[PDB]
Amino acid sequence: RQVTIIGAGLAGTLVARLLARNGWQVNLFERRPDPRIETGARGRSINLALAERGAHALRLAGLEREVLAEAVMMRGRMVHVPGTPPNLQPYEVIWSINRDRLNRILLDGAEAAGASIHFNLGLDSVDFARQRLTLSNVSGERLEKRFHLLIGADGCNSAVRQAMASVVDLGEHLETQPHGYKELQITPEASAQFNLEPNALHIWPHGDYMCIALPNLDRSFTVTLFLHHQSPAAQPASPSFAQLVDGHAARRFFQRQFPDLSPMLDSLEQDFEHHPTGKLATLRLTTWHVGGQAVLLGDAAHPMVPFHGQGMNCALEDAVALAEHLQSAADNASALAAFTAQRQPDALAIQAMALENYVEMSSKVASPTYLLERELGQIMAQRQPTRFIPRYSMVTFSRLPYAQAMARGQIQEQLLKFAVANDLTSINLDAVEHEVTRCLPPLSH
Numbered sequence: 273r274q275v276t277i278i279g280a281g282l283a284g285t286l287v288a289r290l291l292a293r294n295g296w297q298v299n300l301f302e303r304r305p306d307p308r309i310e311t312g313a314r315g316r317s318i319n320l321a322l323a324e325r326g327a328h329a330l331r332l333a334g335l336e337r338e339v340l341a342e343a344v345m346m347r348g349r350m351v352h353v354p355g356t357p358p359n360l361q362p363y364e365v366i367w368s369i370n371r372d373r374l375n376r377i378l379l380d381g382a383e384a385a386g387a388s389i390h391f392n393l394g395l396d397s398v399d400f401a402r403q404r405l406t407l408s409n410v411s412g413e414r415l416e417k418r419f420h421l422l423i424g425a426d427g428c429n430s431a432v433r434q435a436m437a438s439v440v441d442l443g444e445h446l447e448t449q450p451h452g453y454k455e456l457q458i459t460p461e462a463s464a465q466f467n468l469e470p471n472a473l474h475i476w477p478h479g480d481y482m483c484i485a486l487p488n489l490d491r492s493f494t495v496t497l498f499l500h501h502q503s504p505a506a507q508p509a510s511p512s513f514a515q516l517v518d519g520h521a522a523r524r525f526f527q528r529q530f531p532d533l534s535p536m537l538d539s540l541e542q543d544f545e546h547h548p549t550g551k552l553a554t555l556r557l558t559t560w561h562v563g564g565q566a567v568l569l570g571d572a573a574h575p576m577v578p579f580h581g582q583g584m585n586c587a588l589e590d591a592v593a594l595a596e597h598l599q600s601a602a603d604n605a606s607a608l609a610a611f612t613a614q615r616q617p618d619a620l621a622i623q624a625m626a627l628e629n630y631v632e633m634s635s636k637v638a639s640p641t642y643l644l645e646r647e648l649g650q651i652m653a654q655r656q657p658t659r660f661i662p663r664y665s666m667v668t669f670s671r672l673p674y675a676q677a678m679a680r681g682q683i684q685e686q687l688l689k690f691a692v693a694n695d696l697t698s699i700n701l702d703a704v705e706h707e708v709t710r711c712l713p714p715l716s717h
């Protein structure tokens with residue numbers, strides 16, 4: 273009945289609330305300070321896309337209305353490319369939520385449910401044999417604490433995950449990507465001056481690099497630049513973080529490549545030199561738990577590239593699943609095994625689907641095969657909105673488990689490919705629709 277959670281982020285704080293109100297004694301430890309303590313100057317955090325499946329996880333926790341109150345409705349996407357004014361491409365919605373706003377709400381929810389939360393305390397080591405762990409603060413205190421069940425919700429660099437290696441082989445494989453990212457900020461004045469639409473997701477596509485911006489209720493926007501770390505050996509002058517040696521270089525790059533975005537980025541030079549360049553990676557594990565003693569949740573279990581906007585959504589789903597299993601199972605070891613069996617297939621799937629979105633960020637001309645496929649898929653979905661559901665729509669706008677969206681997507685892509693092989697005018701749409709009904713079962717099977 274006792275549980276210790278490391279990491280008061282999105283997954284850890286949600287699972288604290290779900291367990292605490294299910295009668296667990298919950299202690300939650302966080303390395304950062306309490307964002308609920310009002311200071312004189314609020315810091316900036318990123319805005320995240322919350323999709324239907326994440327919103328539904330919050331509804332099960334009884335916190336959806338709270339979060340929605342501070343979330344910006346995004347009705348569609350606005351693509352910005354030179355030579356056209358952007359116009360809204362309508363989506364059904366995606367909510368833009370501020371990370372720290374969400375976190376404060378989750379924290380209040382966890383505490384209201386009876387969890388004890390401890391801030392400014394980082395997990396440094398775990399001794400599984402002696403079931404003790406040690407927390408450290410900046411005051412030099414080294415706090416040794418006893419634990420029964422340990423939930424690692426401590427993010428993509430999990431200290432819990434690292435500790436688990438000492439006692440079990442996690443079968444880790446880290447796959448890195450050549451793009452990094454940089455977080456930047458459009459202020460409310462700038463967005464208003466350039467009439468940036470608050471109720472939309474904004475994209476600046478540019479072949480091998482790109483910017484995406486999500487809104488905040490105060491009309492500021494957080495912008496993410498995705499760009500190669502280094503210029504390719506054979507394409508040595510192409511843009512990369514390696515060339516952008518300082519803020520002035522960054523400014524010249526934005527001026528040249530993102531002319532209409534550069535004016536909105538007032539602290540670009542500042543932001544570029546301070547904010548570290550983030551890495552893109554996928555980490556996969558064969559095992560998420562050590563018997564009944566510890567389990568990994570969210571980014572701690574399954575780091576993924578941020579290209580389908582689903583990491584937080586997955587983490588919130590994870591929390592719901594972990595608390596469901598901990599209640600309905602015989603013992604903790606069985607719960608953790610069952611949890612891993614449910615969610616690890618979903619995690620691998622979204623990790624893969626995220627990478628597939630990522631690889632499209634290319635200046636390579638799209639193969640006419642892939643183009644005809646997508647165009648044919650659109651037609652089929654129109655004719656049988658029943659069965660043929662585009663995979664992105666299954667992921668982003670439904671609650672269908674990721675593994676099942678990936679499976680239906682495979683059946684669908686395969687059908688499209690055999691149909692398109694060897695322009696669309698020669699393709700018999702009746703023959704294709706016949707194959708769609710023969711090969712793709714309705715959702716009710």
Ligand SMILES: Cc1cc2nc3c(=O)[nH]c(=O)nc-3n(C[C@H](O)[C@H](O)[C@H](O)COP(=O)(O)OP(=O)(O)OC[C@H]3O[C@@H](n4cnc5c(N)ncnc54)[C@H](O)[C@@H]3O)c2cc1C
Pocket residue numbers: 278279280281282283284301302303304319320321322393394395396425426427428429430431453496550569570571572578581582583584585586587
């Ligand atoms: C550029 C970018 C854009 C993204 N956009 C989206 C998006 O639009 N939508 C979406 O769904 N996802 C998005 N994601 C993914 C999303 O941020 C993560 O998947 C999600 O935050 C993971 O939730 P979590 O609780 O598992 O981890 P976290 O939210 O990272 O929580 C981990 C917590 O543990 C704490 N902690 C860490 N180490 C320790 C320690 N040793 N001791 C104690 N506490 C510790 C941290 O302070 C933190 O509070 C994005 C990610 C990136 C990088």
Ligand SMILES: COc1ccc(S(=O)(=O)Nc2nc(-c3cccc([N+](=O)[O-])c3)cs2)cc1OC
Pocket residue numbers: 320321349361366484486496578579580581582629664665667668
């Ligand atoms: C306009 O139609 C589309 C609808 C949906 C998608 S999607 O579902 O497949 N990908 C998605 N990425 C995000 C997302 C949000 C925040 C940050 C990031 N990020 O890359 O950091 C990604 C939201 S939806 C794509 C579409 O066209 C490309």
Ligand SMILES: COc1ccc(S(=O)(=O)Nc2nc(-c3cccc([N+](=O)[O-])c3)cs2)cc1OC
Pocket residue numbers: 628642645646647648649650661662663664680681682684685688
């Ligand atoms: C990995 O490759 C695929 C995987 C899955 C599928 S699918 O058949 O299951 N989903 C489909 N999406 C579209 C579609 C159309 C218009 C815009 C978008 N959009 O991402 O914005 C998608 C057409 S078909 C297709 C694939 O390539 C054709």
